[PDB]
């Protein structure tokens, strides 16, 4: 049975190791990557190409592993991007900023690199795509991990009076956070602390410097009561827990970010029943027939919450993108791609906006989803495998 | 590469034959079906069960084929329904009406059965689910086929002045129709003729008796100019070109129908650029910012066209269903099903409405798509394989 509809298929996950990765597999992978890279240069360099092939082979045998040239890493992070079946923004693949923190060693050094990142990328609202590569997995017992699903994310508490406050999606991580000594500010929009694990050590908590988390206060351009819902969201979508695989190497810590596509905050974060779940309150406050589904009131509401989100980001000068423009963009990417290298790994179930499905062009496009390399994999949640001091 | 996003995968098609189907494969399939059937009876009948198993085996060997008991066919049509990965209405699976036309022989006899069907099912607007099984494929050279994609469908012409009028989706079938002697009425909503092929003979055309095609005139409940768009649609969704496979047997002709889910006419038929494509005219006539995609005007328009469609069907007393109710319905079906037999072949890419994606519950449900039996397959278009007199 085609399992296309599963969220975290094993095929897409790259789990924990206990010992270096077998040279039998590591070597041919590395040769593959090096060929990819030199092969990418318009105008080749066989001298250099051959030299590198050799150098790497040596190192791998003299050390059972190898290190990438900063140039090769910059090429790895983008290709990995380029090969992300579930991203609509890939038309921007070649435009990434890479922060090489491969020489990091402590958690506080991590906490600093992440801050340099959050700051570089936010740019006072003019968002820039960036990535921060930490030390590559070596023996699997010294892995660098970020226990957060994403850099800036809001906490989710379970109130005394039984009601859940904040983002229910993070109720569990939040407890853990609290278990590790974080002071719960019991809000609806409390930015979660960075929980960092460096060189295999138990995880360490760090509050994100408030000045660094840019936020957008939600207000609709016709409805004055929109603002009364006292809603807001962070401007930076930064995925924090994925693994970068390139030429046999695995970087278990490599936060990356882009800008937002409105429907994420719009439809998913706010409207999902298992998230901020604000669809009824917005329905009611619109006078809609909130008690008859056939009235299509949800379709009606959600579009306004979407206009609010977009309106707010534009008004505040924060970068954002609507799903339509996103889709036409991806469509053009896909064509560049088929022309450029005849193919584009694409996952329709993800590439199609969560609203306005068929009004969007990607809905009518047949796609082939396949995992290439380099690639960004998922990982088992650390607290599930981590061995404590 | 998972090819989940392809429309007509071979896996889902059951093509033409040239000779009976090999007893080696036909027999074990038949035994499987018979066991399924007797196995379905609450309170068994092993006597009968065993007797049938034997009877069928005989027949198959004495004739290289076999015939189903009307009871078995009634069970085949529903199970096939029950096992239609791409249908949201399966909660209604056990409620089908079966018209046994297995003794048909001529095209005019077909044209009559179809009319009995179109009439039984329309019911003056109170739609009833029904199916009409024609003679099963025998040697593959005497197949009964309906060349239409669906019973009632509108024609699509290519105007002199270069412009395409009617439903562009059927421009090709329409030509053929014309090539076979049909008189083009050059309208925007001209019901296409039934093109029937019986017992392997060349296809024959028949106009559907106008009194039989119930139609719904489109009018919005706030916008008076909606009616000025002079739009309408047929009330009966009847798939005409699929193959029913049961216990090794193949019925290449078996039209079936249900009622409509608003978004089909609403979003797909009217809004798809390659269909009636009315999204801009509705945008403009709403004063929306039809020239800035970020204005979300399409999301805005399409929801009104959807309210129009639903409003019209209710006002005219024709059966229809909105996508939300459809989705909650399918969700309940799925659970009955997992409880009833632990599984439900479901194709997410199809089961999710073309609008309001994530606002719908099926969007958040993981599904496993697999082909069971009995099943309704697709077929190669007749005019592509048919051998002419």
């Amino acid at each position: 049975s085609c399992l296309g509809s599963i969220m975290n298929p094993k095929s897409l996950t790259r789990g924990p190791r206990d010992k270096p990765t077998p040279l039998e597999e590591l070597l041919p992978h590395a040769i593959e990557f090096i060929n990819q890279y030199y092969g990418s240069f318009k105008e080749a360099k066989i001298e250099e190409h051959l030299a590198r092939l050799e150098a790497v082979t040596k190192e791998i045998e003299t050390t059972g592993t190898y290190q990438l040239t900063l140039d090769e890493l910059i090429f790895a992070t983008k290709m990995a991007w380029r090969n992300a079946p579930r991203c609509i923004g890939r038309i921007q693949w070649s435009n990434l900023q890479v922060f090489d923190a491969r020489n990091c060693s402590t958690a506080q050094e991590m906490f600093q690199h992440i801050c340099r990142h959050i700051l570089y990328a936010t740019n006072n609202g003019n968002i820039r795509s960036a990535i921060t590569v930490f030390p590559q997995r070596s023996d699997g017992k010294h892995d660098f991990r970020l226990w957060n699903s994403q850099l800036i994310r809001y906490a989710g508490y379970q109130m005394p009076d039984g009601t859940i406050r904040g983002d229910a999606a993070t109720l569990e991580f939040t407890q853990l956070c609290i278990d590790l000594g974080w002071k719960p500010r019991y809000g609806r929009f409390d930015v979660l602390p960075l929980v960092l694990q460096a060189d295999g050590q138990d995880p360490e908590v760090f509050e994100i410097p408030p000045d660094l988390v840019l936020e957008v206060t939600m207000e609709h351009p016709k409805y004055e009561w929109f603002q009364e819902l006292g809603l807001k969201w962070y401007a930076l979508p930064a995925v924090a827990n994925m693994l970068l695989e390139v030429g046999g190497l695995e970087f278990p810590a490599c936060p990356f970010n882009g800008w937002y596509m409105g429907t994420e905050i719009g439809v998913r974060d706010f409207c999902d029943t298992q998230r901020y779940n604000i669809l009824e309150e917005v329905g009611r406050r619109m006078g809609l027939e909130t008690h008859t589904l056939a009235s299509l009131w949800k379709d009606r509401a959600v579009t306004e919450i979407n206009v609010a989100v977009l309106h707010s980001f534009q008004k505040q000068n924060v970068t954002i993108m609507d799903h339509h423009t996103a889709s036409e963009s991806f469509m053009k990417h896909m064509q560049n791609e088929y022309r450029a290298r005849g193919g584009c790994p694409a996952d329709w179930i993800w590439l199609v906006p969560p609203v306005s499905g068929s009004i969007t062009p990607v809905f009518h496009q047949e796609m082939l989803n396949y995992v290439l390399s380099p690639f960004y994999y998922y990982q088992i949640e650390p607290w599930k495998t981590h061995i404590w001091q | 590469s998972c090819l989940g996003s392809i429309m007509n995968p071979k896996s889902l098609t059951r093509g033409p034959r040239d000779k009976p189907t090999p007893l080696e494969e036909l027999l074990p399939h038949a035994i499987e079906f018979i066991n399924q059937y007797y196995g379905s009876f609450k309170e068994a009948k092993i006597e009968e069960h065993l007797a049938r198993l034997e009877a069928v085996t005989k027949e198959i060997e004495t004739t290289g084929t076999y015939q189903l008991t009307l009871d078995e066919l009634i069970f085949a049509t529903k199970m096939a329904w029950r096992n239609a990965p791409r249908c949201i209405g399966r909660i209604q699976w056990s409620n089908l009406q079966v018209f046994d036309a297995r003794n048909c022989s001529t095209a005019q006899e077909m044209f009559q059965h179809i009319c009995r069907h179109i009439l039984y099912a329309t019911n003056n607007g109170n739609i009833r689910s029904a199916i009409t099984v024609f003679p099963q494929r025998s040697d593959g050279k005497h197949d009964f086929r309906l060349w239409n994609s669906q019973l009632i469908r509108y024609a699509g012409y290519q105007m002199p002045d270069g412009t395409i009028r009617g439903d562009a989706a059927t421009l090709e079938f329409t030509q053929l129709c014309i090539d076979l002697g049909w008189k083009p009425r050059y309208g925007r909503f001209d019901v296409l003729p039934l093109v029937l092929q019986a017992d392997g003979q060349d296809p024959e055309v028949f106009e559907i008796p106008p009194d039989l095609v119930l139609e719904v005139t489109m009018e919005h409940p706030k916008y008076e100019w909606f009616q000025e768009l002079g739009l309408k649609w047929y009330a009966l969704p009847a798939v005409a070109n699929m193959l029913l496979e049961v216990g090794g047997l193949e019925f290449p002709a078996c039209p079936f129908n249900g009622w409509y889910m608003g978004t089909e006419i609403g979003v797909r038929d009217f809004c798809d650029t390659q269909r009636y494509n009315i999204l801009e005219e509705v945008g403009r006539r709403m004063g929306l910012e039809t020239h800035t995609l970020a204005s979300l005007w399409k999301d805005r328009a399409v929801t009104e066209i959807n309210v129009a469609v639903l409003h019209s069907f209710q006002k005219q007393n024709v059966t229809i269903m909105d996508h939300h109710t459809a989705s909650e319905s399918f969700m309940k079906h799925m659970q009955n099903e997992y409880r009833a037999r632990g599984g439900c072949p479901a194709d997410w890419i199809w089961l999710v409405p073309p609008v309001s994606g994530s606002i719908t519950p099926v969007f958040h449900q993981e599904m496993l798509n697999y082909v069971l039996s009995p099943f309704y397959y697709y077929q190669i278009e007749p005019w592509k394989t048919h051998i002419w007199q």
Partner: peptide
């Protein structure tokens, strides 16, 4: 070979050859 991929909106088709480089 290559997989024929089609766009039902524009009738356009593309031939995917890159999948060959798929990992297992």
């Amino acid at each position: 070979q290559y997989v024929r991929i089609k766009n039902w909106g524009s009738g356009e088709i593309l031939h995917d050859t890159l999948h060959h480089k798929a990992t297992s």
